[PDB]
Amino acid sequence: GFLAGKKILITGLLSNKSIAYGIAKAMHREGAELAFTYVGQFKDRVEKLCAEFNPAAVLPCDVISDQEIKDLFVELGKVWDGLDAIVHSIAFAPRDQLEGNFIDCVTREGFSIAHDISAYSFAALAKEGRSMMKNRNASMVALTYIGAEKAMPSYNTMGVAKASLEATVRYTALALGEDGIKVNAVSAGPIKTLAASGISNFKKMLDYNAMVSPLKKNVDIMEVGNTVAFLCSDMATGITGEVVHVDAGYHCVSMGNVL
Template sequence: MPLLEGKKAFIFGVANHRSIAWAIAQALAAEGAQLVLAYQERMEKYVRDLAAKIPGTELVLCDVQQDDQLDAAFTRAGEIFGGSIDILVHCVAFAPPSELENPFLDTTRAGFHTALDISAYSLIAMAKRAEPLMKANGGSIFALTYMASERVMPKYNVMAVAKAALECSVRYLAFELGEHNIRVNAISAGPLNTLAARGISGFTGFRDQVSQVAPLRRNIEQSEVGDTALFLSSSLSRGITGEVIFVDAGYNIMGA
């Protein structure tokens, strides 16, 4: 029997075929999960084309900065899934490009607010709306983070602060939702060639460094994050919550 037979997964953050969220969607669907993908209006064509590759996948519009759209998206997902959700995947992050190009010291109030709102607060907003749909049977919520939350990665700037806030939110949500058997975790993926990563200066050079320094002497692939997401979605991870799981070929353990 497929690992996720009968499970229902609501996934935020698919943008194109390189998205980590898309790798996660494929991994979950391959093990029997029914999917609903949330999309931003400007990304509809790309997400719709991808969704067509997984039969039965539904789409809902959602801008995570708009409470009314979040309300409507979770209401619609609940309807599609028959009143419950088992898995919620948060792969949402954004900061204005200027905040990643300028020195961190020049971070603007507006840029800070945007990065924290979209990249961190959105997890809290999603979890709040998912809780009524999960509490009867429990579930798994997980988000994508990055080790810049703990170490300085030049040019990651305010996004690093947002990822630190995201990880702290994971722990507090894990504490509050645990009584309903809802687990909340994060995956800290190594550098991948995604749309978001290409906006960071020096990204290519850093990927080269990882392949030389990481214990496995290589970079990771999107599918490896997808496999970890599958584990967190399944009963195999039923005793794990509030954790950050690194999928980076071991780079995070190194001193340089």
């Protein structure tokens, strides 16, 4: 496999629908040795789910906490002498941030929390993981969404947080490139995961995507996972600071024939 022997930390695996589950399957297929994180309450659920990937460790990490991120790498360092990649598949904004008019709904605390968990946490993992990732053609990949680039209904504070995340990815690529670490993002089309479950007309966003995209379909977690896997391989060593859309071509069209 094209990731044979590479040691990769995957955050954000919550259910078998999670994007991180597709990432895990693809990476396990390609021979990677995997470790996983979970937010406190979900310990049992995640442990059971990632057991199919023969994980080297399954460790708590709530990215609101500097201490938990520090302790993640301490514990990981007890099982691994070095780290090849970190996959960031984590996002959060308070429910009230999403849906409704952006200016009606946005709040100072909501904006702050969304940025903290969805964007800062990428830099946080880079800061604490860097010493393990030095000088081994290491990789980081974050998951993002086109709401970073364009104003969209409902996505609201999360769109702003994703724009912050994409800039964080570029500045991280610059910061870590001297150590041979490449740093990229995958901008996924919508996928019905647990993140979708708060969103009333989500299925309708899916329907629109399948209608308007060049490929006339919705993407799946394997299409996303396989791309994330490629971006942590030696094949991808000339790629950094890049956002690769895995969205059936949605990003490249405007209007379409069906108005």
